[PDB]
Structure formats: structure tokens, C-alpha cells
């Protein structure tokens, strides 16, 4: 019923409740002043907040727009300020460092998830060990931050280093994975 679930974070401390998307076209903004399709970060709260965070939480602006189609996810940077994505899947696709972090230019869009490759990987690994088919678990979760980058070619080198970011859990890919592990024993 929910293709995914975005959990918002501030540095290393999670913030607000997990948002579940029962829509396919879901926007994640940061503006201010209840709303199905939109997931607004701006109406959230944190005390551990501060200047360094306050400042970034204003550049999120139009934020990001995630699209789920046919079993594939897309991300368009609606914010006047960049967006940084790290998807093991999106990477494996373009043959990137499996940990590469992708900068989606304001106005731009990128396919952070391809289901076809996934199902491929999955079956391509079932006959390759359990622990293998399991780490494919790491693929069902994408993590994107706002404004400030991280990982290689950045001062910040782990998402926890950024003032704000999200975590997107792809249930579809997670579901199968289980069903595969399950049948890998009985």
C-alpha cells in the first residue's frame, strides 16, 4: 500500500515521525503554514536545532519531488538549492562506486531506483549465498540530504554530517527480498 517511507533526520538525530506515502507523486518540501501528497519538513520540531541547521532548513525550499512509476523511483530537485542522493542501486546501474553520492542540480531529475536491475541482482545472487541475497537489503534503502553534500569530494563524509536529510525505504524491493530469503530455507 505504501511504496516507501521517508524518515527525516537532523545530523545524527532522527526528527519527526516516519511519513508513509500512499501516493505516487510525493513532494518533500520545507516550507511553512495536514496534506496527503506533500510531506512538509518545516512544521517539525527539534530543540537540538541551531544556526548551522536553521540556515540549511531554509534552503530546502521547494525541496524534492519523488515519483514512483511502474516500480521505479525518480527524484526531481524542486528546491532552488541542490540535492544529494546515495543509492546503491542507482550507482550499480550507472556503474558508479557503490557508495557514490549523486548531486541532483536544482531543477534536475534522476532515477534513483531501477526495479529491473534489482530483480536481476536478486536472482543473480540467490544462487550465490544467503548473506549475499541479504545485503541486497542495503539496496532497498536510499538516503538523500539537502543542500550540503557528503561522502567523497566533500568536507562532510557521512550523511550524519549534514544538517538535514532523509531516508527512503523501498518496501516493494524489500518485500520480495524477504520472500526470497524465506524460500532459501524451510
How was this model experimentally determined? X-ray
Tell me how many domains the chain contains.
1
Q: Of 91, 87, 66, 63, which Cα lies nearest the Cα of 164?
A: 63
Separation CA 127–CA 132 (nearest Å): 9
CATH of residue 141's domain is 2.60.200.10
Separation CA 147–CA 80 (nearest Å): 9
Domain that residue 135 falls in: 1-186
**27 is written with which cell numbers?**
513532494
| CA distances to 21, 32, 89 from 2, in Å | 5, 25, 20
Amino acid at each position: 500500500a505504501f511504496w516507501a517511507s521517508i524518515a527525516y533526520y537532523e545530523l545524527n538525530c532522527r526528527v519527526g515521525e516516519v511519513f508513509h506515502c500512499n501516493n505516487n507523486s510525493v513532494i518533500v518540501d520545507g516550507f511553512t503554514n495536514n496534506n496527503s501528497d506533500r510531506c512538509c519538513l518545516g512544521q517539525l520540531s527539534n530543540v537540538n536545532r541551531n544556526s548551522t541547521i536553521e540556515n540549511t532548513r531554509r534552503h530546502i525550499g521547494k525541496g524534492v519531488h519523488l515519483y514512483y512509476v511502474t516500480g521505479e523511483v525518480y527524484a526531481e530537485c524542486l528546491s532552488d538549492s541542490a540535492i544529494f542522493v546515495q543509492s546503491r542501486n542507482c550507482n550499480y546501474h550507472h556503474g558508479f562506486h557503490p557508495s557514490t553520492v549523486c548531486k541532483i542540480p536544482p531543477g534536475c531529475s534522476l532515477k534513483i531506483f531501477n526495479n529491473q536491475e534489482f530483480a536481476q541482482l536478486l536472482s543473480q545472487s540467490v544462487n550465490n549465498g544467503f548473506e549475499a541475497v541479504y545485503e541486497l537489503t542495503k539496496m532497498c534503502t536510499i538516503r538523500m540530504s539537502f543542500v550540503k553534500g557528503w561522502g567523497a569530494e566533500y568536507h562532510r563524509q557521512d550523511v550524519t554530517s549534514t544538517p538535514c536529510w532523509i531516508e527512503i525505504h523501498l518496501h516493494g524491493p524489500l518485500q520480495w527480498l524477504d520472500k526470497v530469503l524465506t524460500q532459501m530455507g524451510s
